[PDB]
Short mmCIF file of C-alpha atoms and ligand atoms in Angstrom, two decimals:
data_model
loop_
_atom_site.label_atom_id
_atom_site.label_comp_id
_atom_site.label_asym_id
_atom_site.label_seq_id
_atom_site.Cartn_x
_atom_site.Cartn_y
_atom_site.Cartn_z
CA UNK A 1 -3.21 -18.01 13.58
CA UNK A 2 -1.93 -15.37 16.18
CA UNK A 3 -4.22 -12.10 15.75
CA UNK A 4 -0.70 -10.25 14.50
CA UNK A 5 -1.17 -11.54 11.25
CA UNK A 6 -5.13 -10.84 10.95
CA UNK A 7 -5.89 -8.67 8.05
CA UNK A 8 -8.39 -6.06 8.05
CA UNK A 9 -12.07 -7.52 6.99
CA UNK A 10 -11.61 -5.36 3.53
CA UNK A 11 -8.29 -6.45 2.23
CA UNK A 12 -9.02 -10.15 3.49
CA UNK A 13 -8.74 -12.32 0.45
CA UNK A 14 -11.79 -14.27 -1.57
CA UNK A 15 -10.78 -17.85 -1.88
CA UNK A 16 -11.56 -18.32 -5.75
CA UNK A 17 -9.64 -15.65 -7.55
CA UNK A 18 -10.01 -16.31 -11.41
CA UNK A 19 -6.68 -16.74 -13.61
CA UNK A 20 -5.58 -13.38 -15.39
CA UNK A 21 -6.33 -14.73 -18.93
CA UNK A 22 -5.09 -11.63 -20.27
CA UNK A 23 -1.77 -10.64 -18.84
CA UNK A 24 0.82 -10.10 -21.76
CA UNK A 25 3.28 -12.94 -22.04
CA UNK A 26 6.09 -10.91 -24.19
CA UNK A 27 8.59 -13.42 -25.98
CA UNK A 28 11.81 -11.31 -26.08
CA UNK A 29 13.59 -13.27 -29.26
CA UNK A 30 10.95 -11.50 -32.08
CA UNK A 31 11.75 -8.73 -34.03
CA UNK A 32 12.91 -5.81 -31.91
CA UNK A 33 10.06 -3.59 -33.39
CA UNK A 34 7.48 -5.88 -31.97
CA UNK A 35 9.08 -6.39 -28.71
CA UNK A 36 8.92 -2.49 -28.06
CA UNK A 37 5.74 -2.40 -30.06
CA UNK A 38 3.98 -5.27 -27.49
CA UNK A 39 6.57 -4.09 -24.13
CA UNK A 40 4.83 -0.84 -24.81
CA UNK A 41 0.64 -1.39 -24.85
CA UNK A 42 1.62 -4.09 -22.13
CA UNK A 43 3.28 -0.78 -19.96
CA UNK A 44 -0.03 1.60 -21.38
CA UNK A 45 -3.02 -0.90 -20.85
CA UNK A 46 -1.98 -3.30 -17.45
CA UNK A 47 1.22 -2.73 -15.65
CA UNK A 48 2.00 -6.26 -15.36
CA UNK A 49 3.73 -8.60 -18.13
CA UNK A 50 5.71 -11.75 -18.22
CA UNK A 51 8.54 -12.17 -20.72
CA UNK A 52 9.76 -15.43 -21.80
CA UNK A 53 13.22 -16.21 -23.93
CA UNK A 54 14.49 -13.31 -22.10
CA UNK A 55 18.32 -14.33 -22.37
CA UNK A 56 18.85 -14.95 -18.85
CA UNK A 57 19.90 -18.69 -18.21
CA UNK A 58 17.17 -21.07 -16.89
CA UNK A 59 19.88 -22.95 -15.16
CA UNK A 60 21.46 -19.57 -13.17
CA UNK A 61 17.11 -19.14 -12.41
CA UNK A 62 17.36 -22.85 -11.33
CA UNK A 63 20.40 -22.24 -8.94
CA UNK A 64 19.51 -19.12 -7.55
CA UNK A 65 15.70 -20.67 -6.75
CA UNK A 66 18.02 -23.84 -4.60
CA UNK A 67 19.94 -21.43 -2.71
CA UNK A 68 17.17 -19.22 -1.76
CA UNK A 69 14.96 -22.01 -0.62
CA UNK A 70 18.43 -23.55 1.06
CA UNK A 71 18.83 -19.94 2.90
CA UNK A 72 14.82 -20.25 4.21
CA UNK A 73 15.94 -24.05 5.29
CA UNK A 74 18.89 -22.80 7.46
CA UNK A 75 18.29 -23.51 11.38
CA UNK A 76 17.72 -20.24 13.77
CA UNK A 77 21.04 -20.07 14.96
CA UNK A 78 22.10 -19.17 11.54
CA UNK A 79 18.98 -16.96 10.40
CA UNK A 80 19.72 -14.65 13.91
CA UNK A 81 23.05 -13.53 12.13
CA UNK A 82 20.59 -11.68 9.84
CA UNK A 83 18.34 -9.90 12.26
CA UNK A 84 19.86 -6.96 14.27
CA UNK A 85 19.42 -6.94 17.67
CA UNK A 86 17.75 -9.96 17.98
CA UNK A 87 14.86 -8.97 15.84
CA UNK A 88 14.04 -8.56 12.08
CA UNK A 89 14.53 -5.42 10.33
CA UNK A 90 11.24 -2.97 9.29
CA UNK A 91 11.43 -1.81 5.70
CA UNK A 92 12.26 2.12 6.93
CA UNK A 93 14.60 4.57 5.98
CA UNK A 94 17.42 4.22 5.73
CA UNK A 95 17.09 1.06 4.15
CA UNK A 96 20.35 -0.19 4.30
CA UNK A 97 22.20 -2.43 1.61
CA UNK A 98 23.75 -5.10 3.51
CA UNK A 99 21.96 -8.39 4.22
CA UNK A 100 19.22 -8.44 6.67
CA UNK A 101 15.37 -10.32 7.10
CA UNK A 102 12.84 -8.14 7.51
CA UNK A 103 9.46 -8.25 8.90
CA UNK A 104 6.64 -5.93 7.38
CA UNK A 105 2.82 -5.22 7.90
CA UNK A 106 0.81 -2.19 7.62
CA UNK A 107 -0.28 0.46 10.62
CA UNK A 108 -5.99 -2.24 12.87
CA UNK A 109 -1.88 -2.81 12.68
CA UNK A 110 -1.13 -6.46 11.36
CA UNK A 111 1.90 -8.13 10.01
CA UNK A 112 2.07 -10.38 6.11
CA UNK A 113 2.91 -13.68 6.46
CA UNK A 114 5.82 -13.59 4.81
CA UNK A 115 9.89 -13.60 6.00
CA UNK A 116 12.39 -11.50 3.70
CA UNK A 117 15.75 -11.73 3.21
CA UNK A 118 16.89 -8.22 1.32
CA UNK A 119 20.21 -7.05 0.61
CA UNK A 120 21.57 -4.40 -2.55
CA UNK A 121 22.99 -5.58 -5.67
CA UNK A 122 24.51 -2.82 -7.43
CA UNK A 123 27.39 -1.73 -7.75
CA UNK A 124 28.70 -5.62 -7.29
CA UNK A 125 32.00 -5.04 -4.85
CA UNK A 126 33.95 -7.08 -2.21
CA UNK A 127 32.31 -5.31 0.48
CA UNK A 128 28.78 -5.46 -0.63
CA UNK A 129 28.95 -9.19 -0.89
CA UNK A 130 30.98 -9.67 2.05
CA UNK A 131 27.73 -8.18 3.71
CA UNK A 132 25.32 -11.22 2.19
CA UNK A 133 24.54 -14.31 3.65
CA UNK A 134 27.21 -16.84 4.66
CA UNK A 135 25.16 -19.48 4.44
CA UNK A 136 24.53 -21.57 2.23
CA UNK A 137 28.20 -21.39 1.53
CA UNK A 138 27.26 -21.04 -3.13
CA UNK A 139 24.49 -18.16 -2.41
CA UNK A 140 27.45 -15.51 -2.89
CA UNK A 141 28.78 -16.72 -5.97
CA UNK A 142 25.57 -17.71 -7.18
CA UNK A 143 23.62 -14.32 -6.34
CA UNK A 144 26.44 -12.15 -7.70
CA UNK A 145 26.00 -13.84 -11.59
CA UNK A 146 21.68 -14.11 -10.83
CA UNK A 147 21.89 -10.02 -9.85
CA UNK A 148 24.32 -8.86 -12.62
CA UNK A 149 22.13 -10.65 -15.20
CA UNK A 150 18.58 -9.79 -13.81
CA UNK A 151 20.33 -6.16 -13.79
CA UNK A 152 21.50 -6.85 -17.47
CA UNK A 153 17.72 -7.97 -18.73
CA UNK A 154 16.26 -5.33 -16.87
CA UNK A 155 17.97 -2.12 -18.20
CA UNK A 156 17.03 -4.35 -21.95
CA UNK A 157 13.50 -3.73 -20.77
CA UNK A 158 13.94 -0.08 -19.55
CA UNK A 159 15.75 0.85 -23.13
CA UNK A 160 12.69 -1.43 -25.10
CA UNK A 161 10.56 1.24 -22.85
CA UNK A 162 12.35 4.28 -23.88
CA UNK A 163 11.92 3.48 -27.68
CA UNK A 164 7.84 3.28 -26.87
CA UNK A 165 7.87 6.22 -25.38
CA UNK A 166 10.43 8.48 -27.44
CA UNK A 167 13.17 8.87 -24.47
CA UNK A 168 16.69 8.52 -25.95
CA UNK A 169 17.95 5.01 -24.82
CA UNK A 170 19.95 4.66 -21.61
CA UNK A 171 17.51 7.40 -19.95
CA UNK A 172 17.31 5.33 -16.89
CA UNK A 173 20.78 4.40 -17.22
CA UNK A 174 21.88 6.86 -14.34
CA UNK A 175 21.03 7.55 -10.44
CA UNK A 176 16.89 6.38 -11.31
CA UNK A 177 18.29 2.82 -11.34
CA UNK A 178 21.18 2.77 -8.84
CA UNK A 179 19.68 0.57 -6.21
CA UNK A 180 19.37 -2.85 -6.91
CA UNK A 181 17.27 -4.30 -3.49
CA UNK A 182 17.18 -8.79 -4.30
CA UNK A 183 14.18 -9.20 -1.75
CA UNK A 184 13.93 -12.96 -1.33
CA UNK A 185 10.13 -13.57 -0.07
CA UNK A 186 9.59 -17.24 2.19
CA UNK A 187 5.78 -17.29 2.29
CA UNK A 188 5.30 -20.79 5.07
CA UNK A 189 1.91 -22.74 5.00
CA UNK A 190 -0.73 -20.73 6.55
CA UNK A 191 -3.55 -22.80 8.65
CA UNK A 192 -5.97 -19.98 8.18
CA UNK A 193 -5.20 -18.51 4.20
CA UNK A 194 -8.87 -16.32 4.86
CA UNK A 195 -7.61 -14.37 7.65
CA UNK A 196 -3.98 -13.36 6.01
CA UNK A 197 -1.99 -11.84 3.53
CA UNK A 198 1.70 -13.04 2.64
CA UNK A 199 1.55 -9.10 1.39
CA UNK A 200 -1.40 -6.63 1.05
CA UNK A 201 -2.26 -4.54 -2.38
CA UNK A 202 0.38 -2.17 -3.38
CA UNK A 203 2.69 -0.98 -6.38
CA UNK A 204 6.44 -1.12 -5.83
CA UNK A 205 7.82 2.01 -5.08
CA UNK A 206 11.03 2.04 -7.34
CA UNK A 207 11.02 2.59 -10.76
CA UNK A 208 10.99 -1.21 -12.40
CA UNK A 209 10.40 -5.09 -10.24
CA UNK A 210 11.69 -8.44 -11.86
CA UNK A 211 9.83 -11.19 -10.06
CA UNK A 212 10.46 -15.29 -10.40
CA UNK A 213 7.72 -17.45 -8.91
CA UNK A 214 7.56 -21.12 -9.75
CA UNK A 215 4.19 -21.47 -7.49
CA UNK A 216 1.16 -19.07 -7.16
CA UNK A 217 0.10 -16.68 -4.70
CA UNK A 218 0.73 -13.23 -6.43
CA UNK A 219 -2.56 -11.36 -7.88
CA UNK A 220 -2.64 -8.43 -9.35
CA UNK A 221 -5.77 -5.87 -9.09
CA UNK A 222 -7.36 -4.88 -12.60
CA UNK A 223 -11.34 -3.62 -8.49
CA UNK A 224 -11.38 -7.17 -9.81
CA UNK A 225 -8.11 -9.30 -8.48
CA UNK A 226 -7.11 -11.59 -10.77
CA UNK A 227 -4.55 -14.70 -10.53
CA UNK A 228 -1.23 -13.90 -12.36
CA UNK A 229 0.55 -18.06 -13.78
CA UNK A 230 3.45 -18.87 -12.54
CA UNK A 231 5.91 -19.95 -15.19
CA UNK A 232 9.27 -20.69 -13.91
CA UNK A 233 11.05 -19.81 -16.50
CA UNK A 234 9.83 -16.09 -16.84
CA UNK A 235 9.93 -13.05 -14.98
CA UNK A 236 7.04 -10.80 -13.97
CA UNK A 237 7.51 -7.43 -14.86
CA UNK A 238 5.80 -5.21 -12.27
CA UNK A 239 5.94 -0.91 -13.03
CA UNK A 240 6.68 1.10 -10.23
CA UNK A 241 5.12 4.16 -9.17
CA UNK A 242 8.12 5.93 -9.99
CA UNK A 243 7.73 5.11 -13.47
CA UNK A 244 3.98 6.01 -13.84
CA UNK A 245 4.95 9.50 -12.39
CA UNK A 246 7.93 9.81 -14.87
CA UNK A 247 6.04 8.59 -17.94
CA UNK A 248 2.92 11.25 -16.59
CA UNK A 249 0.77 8.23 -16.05
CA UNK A 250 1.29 7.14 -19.75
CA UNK A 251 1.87 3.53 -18.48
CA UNK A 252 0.01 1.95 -15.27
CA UNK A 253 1.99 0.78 -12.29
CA UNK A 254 1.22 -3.03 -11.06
CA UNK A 255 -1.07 -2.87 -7.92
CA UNK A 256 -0.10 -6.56 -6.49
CA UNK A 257 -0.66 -8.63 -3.43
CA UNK A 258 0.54 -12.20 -2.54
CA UNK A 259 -1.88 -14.63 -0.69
CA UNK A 260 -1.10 -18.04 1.55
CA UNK A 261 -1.67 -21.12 0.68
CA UNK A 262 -2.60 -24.03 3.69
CA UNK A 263 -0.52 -26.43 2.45
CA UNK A 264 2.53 -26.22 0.50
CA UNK A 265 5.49 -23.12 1.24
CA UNK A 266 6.94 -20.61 -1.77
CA UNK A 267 9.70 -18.87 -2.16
CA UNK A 268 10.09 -15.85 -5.32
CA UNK A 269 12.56 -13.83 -5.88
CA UNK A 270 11.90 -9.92 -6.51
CA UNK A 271 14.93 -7.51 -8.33
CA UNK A 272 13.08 -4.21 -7.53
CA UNK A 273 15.06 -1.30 -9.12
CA UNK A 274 15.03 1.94 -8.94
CA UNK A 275 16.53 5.53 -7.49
CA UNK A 276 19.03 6.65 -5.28
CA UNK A 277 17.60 8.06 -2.18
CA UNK A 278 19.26 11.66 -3.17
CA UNK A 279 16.81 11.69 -6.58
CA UNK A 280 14.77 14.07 -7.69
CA UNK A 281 11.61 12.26 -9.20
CA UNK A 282 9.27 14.14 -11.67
CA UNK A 283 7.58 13.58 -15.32
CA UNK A 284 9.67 13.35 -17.58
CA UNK A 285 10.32 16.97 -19.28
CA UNK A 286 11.05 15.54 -22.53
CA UNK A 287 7.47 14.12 -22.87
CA UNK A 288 5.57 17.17 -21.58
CA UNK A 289 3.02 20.14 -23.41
CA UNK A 290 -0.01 22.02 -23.34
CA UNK A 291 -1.81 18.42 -23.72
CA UNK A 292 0.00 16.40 -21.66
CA UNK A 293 0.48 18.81 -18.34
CA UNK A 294 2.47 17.51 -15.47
CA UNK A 295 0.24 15.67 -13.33
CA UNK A 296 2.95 15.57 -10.55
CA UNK A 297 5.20 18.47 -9.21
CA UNK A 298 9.21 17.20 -8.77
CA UNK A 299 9.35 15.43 -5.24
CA UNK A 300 12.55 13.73 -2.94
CA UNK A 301 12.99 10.68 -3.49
CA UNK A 302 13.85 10.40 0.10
CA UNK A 303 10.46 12.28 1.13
CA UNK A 304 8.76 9.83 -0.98
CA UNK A 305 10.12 6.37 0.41
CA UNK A 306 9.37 7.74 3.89
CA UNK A 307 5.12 8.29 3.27
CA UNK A 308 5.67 4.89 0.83
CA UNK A 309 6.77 2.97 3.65
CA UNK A 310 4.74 3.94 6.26
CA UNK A 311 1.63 5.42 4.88
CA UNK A 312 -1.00 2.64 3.65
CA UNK A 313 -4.55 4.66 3.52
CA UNK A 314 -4.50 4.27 -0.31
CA UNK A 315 -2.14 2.45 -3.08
CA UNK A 316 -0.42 6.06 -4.16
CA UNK A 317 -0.99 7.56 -0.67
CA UNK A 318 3.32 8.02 -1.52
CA UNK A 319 2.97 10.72 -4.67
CA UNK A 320 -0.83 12.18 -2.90
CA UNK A 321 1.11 15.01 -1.81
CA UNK A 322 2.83 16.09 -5.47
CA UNK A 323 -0.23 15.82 -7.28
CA UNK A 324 -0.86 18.52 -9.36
CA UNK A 325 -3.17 19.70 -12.56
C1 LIG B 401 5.73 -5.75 -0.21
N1 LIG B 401 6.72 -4.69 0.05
C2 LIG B 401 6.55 -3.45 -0.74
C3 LIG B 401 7.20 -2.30 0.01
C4 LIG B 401 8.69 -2.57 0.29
O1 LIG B 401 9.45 -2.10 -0.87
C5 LIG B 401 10.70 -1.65 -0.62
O2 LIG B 401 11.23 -1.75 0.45
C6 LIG B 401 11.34 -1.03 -1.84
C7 LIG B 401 12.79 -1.49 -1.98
O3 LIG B 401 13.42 -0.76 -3.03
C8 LIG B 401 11.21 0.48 -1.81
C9 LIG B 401 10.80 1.18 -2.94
C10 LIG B 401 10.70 2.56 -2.92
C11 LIG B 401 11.01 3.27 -1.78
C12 LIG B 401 11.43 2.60 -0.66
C13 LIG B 401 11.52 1.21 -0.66
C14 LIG B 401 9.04 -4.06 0.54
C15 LIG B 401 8.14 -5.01 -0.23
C16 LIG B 401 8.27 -4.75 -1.71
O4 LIG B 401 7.14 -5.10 -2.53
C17 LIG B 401 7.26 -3.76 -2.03
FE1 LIG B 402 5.66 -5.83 -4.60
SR1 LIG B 403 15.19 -13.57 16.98
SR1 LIG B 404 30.19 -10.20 6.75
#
């Protein structure tokens, strides 16, 4: 492969990466105590669960997997109407809503194997959409219903996590989960998977991640990395690191990577929500005392992002500079 993509020797991946046996898969349709009660140690102990019977159609996950591989299928003449100036987009501020594929990479400066297509989500109106792909002509109509009901199961899952904490429900219901970013990751056959990374260890930034894989690739580190099943039918939930500073570190955030296969392609599909740019993060007040000090001093969100998207030295090299205590 072309030395762009080489990783550093360190963050290279080992080639037999054992299946996380122990990742939580949380079946949504049991008794709303022990949804919160398992949502809850699953937030506390790894980060990183899986719910199933989550009451988002399989067929809409079906339908909005086709259109997303049909986008990565389109010829270059139609996948240049996507990159400004002639040339992908770098996930920088400000990262803009409309429809773009981006290229990323850290700065021993390589770049993932891996294309995105990102866009917003929320709130759904004509100009937004008119702003996503026009091709393949269902991806509008089918990413509008896919976004409004990932957004739907999500904020379930943010008000499950509000009972396990004691937060009165709908406390992310505000400007902490106004952007909606869809990031639709192509990962193409690699001829040299040793050398690469489709994306290199990190948390999400934002506050909460939906993910839907149907093939594996995405790890999560535990500094063992282990192998996190793809079921098609589920979503990965990955914690930001907004959320482990507003819980006070009461709940991990998911440190994940993706590796390349040699072989076959994958597509997944990533709902990453979270604040508004103009938000003030900090721990949550509410939780606070003389035993559980703030760990973090209120920070821009703004601020933030910039040092999240840039810096790469460590995992939480974006909340370094608001540690406190
Ligand atoms: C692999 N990268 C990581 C970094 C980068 O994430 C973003 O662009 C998110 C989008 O909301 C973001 C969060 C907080 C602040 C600014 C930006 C793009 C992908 C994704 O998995 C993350
Ligand atoms: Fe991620
Ligand atoms: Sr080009
Ligand atoms: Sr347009």
């Amino acid at each position: 492969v072309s030395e762009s993509f080489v990783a550093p020797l360190e963050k290279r991946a080992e080639n037999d990466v054992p299946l996380g046996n122990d990742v939580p898969i949380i079946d949504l349709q049991q008794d709303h105590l022990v949804v919160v009660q398992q949502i809850t140690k699953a937030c506390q102990d790894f980060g990183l669960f899986q719910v199933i019977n989550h009451g988002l159609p399989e067929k809409l996950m079906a339908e909005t997997m086709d259109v997303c591989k049909e986008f990565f299928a389109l010829p270059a003449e139609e996948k240049e109407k996507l990159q400004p100036k002639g040339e992908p987009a770098k996930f920088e501020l400000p990262l803009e809503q409309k429809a773009k594929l981006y290229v990323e990479g850290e700065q021993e400066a390589f770049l993932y194997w891996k294309d995105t297509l990102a866009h917003g989500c929320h709130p759904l109106d004509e100009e937004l959409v008119n702003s996503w792909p026009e091709k393949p002509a269902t991806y509008r109509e089918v990413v509008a219903k896919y976004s409004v009901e990932v957004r739907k199961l999500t904020m379930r899952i943010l008000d499950y996590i509000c009972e396990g904490l004691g937060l009165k429900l709908g406390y992310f219901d505000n400007e902490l989960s106004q952007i909606q970013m869809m990031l639709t990751n192509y990962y193409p056959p690699c001829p040299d998977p040793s050398s690469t990374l489709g994306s290199g260890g990190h948390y999400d930034g934002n506050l909460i991640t939906l993910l839907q894989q149907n093939l594996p690739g995405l790890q999560q580190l535990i500094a063992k990395w282990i192998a996190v099943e793809p079921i098609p039918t589920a979503f990965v939930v990955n914690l930001g690191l907004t959320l482990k500073v507003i819980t006070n570190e009461k709940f991990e955030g998911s440190i994940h990577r993706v590796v390349t296969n040699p072989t076959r392609d994958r597509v997944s599909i990533a709902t990453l929500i979270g604040p508004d740019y103009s938000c003030t993060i900090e721990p949550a007040k509410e939780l606070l005392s003389q035993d559980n000090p703030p760990l973090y001093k209120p920070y821009s969100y703004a601020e933030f992002g910039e040092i999240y998207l840039s810096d790469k030295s460590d995992y939480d090299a974006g909340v370094k500079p608001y540690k406190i205590n």
